[PDB]
Amino acid sequence: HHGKLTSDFDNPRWIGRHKHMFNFLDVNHNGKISLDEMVYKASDIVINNLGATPEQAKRHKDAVEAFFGGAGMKYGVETDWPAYIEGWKKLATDELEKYAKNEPTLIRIWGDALFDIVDKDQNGAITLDEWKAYTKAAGIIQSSEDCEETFRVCDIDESGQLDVDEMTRQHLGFWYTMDPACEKLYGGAVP
Ligand SMILES: O=C1N2C=C(c3ccc(O)cc3)N=C(Cc3ccccc3)C2=N[C@@]1(Cc1ccc(C(F)(F)F)cc1)OO
């Protein structure tokens, strides 16, 4: 056993995982979010908190734009919760096809662009401090204990590096397939 290629869209925990993220993204409790806000947030984090160059920020923005665009979000459009989770079925389906065709997934392309900013050595592997810095700036994780759970789930020691390759596997299983080996990837921060 090496992974999982089947979706699990009727699992209430898959829906609730993305409901948690929709609420985390819906910072003004409008019940709706826009692609404008998603790409603003992405560039706000990497430029203003993580010291990214304009070129790095552009690469990272294009990756985030394509990712939420793959879930049906568009510029100038407010996406409510039912439109969001329905669009995420399409995003997860299109990603699993690329995954199964051994094509670079949208989540992998996002990871490359992000690791080039977060990793000071820029070889595609991040330290535990670098993962704490990214997730706490984004807010997806608040406590350092949850950041350590990421290293436990990726079977990397806390003193080691986290590569895009192992992270992509866990993220595909955490967001797309409900892979039981990827549970607790964000500790207690994300159901
Ligand atoms: O994957 C991730 N994220 C996933 C989600 C998310 C949002 C909504 C939703 O419904 C489901 C998930 N949000 C965020 C937070 C966010 C949202 C908007 C703008 C800026 C930040 C997020 N940051 C990520 C970045 C990342 C991507 C790829 C890889 C890999 F593995 F490829 F190398 C590792 C890490 O860190 O984990």
Resolution limit, Å: 2.1
The C-alpha atoms of residue 110 and residue 147 are separated, in whole angstroms, by 19
Helix (H, G, I), strand (E, B) or coil at 152: helix
CB contact set of 77 (below 8 Å; sequence gap of 6+): 34, 35
72 contacts 116 by C-beta, under 8 angstroms: no
The C-alpha atoms of residue 85 and residue 98 are separated, in whole angstroms, by 20
The C-alpha atoms of residue 186 and residue 155 are separated, in whole angstroms, by 14
* End-to-end C-alpha distance for the chain, whole angstroms: 24
What's the domain count of the chain?
Answer: 1
Q: What amino acid is encoded at 23 in this protein?
A: N
CATH number at residue 72: 1.10.238.10
Instruction: Ligand 1, residue 168: give the atom nearest the CA.
Output: 31
Helix (H, G, I), strand (E, B) or coil at 79: strand
Cα atoms in the Cβ-side hemisphere of radius 13 Å centred on 8 = 19
18 is catalytic: yes
> Cβ(38) to ligand 1 under 6 A?
yes
The C-alpha atoms of residue 130 and residue 172 are separated, in whole angstroms, by 21
- The structure's method of determination equals X-ray
DSSP code, position 177: I
Q: Which of 25, 50, 20, 47 is nearest to 131 (CA)?
A: 50
Domain span holding position 190:
1-191
The C-alpha atoms of residue 51 and residue 41 are separated, in whole angstroms, by 15
| Number of neighbouring beta carbons within 10 Å of residue 172 | 22
In order of 73, 77, 118, 127, 140, the CA distances from 132 in angstroms are: 28, 32, 10, 9, 10
Instruction: Name the residue with tokens 């806390």.
Output: 158
Instruction: Name the residue with tokens 């690791």.
Output: 115
**Helix count (H) and strand count (E) of the chain?**
8, 4
Atom 5 of ligand 1, nearest CA residue: 21
106 contacts 95 by C-beta, under 8 angstroms: yes
Reported for 180-186, long-range contacts at CB under 8 A and 24+ positions apart, including other chains, are 181/153, 182/153, 183/153, 184/149, 184/152, 184/153, 185/149, 185/150, 185/153, 185/154, 186/135, 186/140, 186/141, 186/146, 186/149, 186/150
Active-site residue, selected from the candidate residues 88, 131, 175, 176: 88
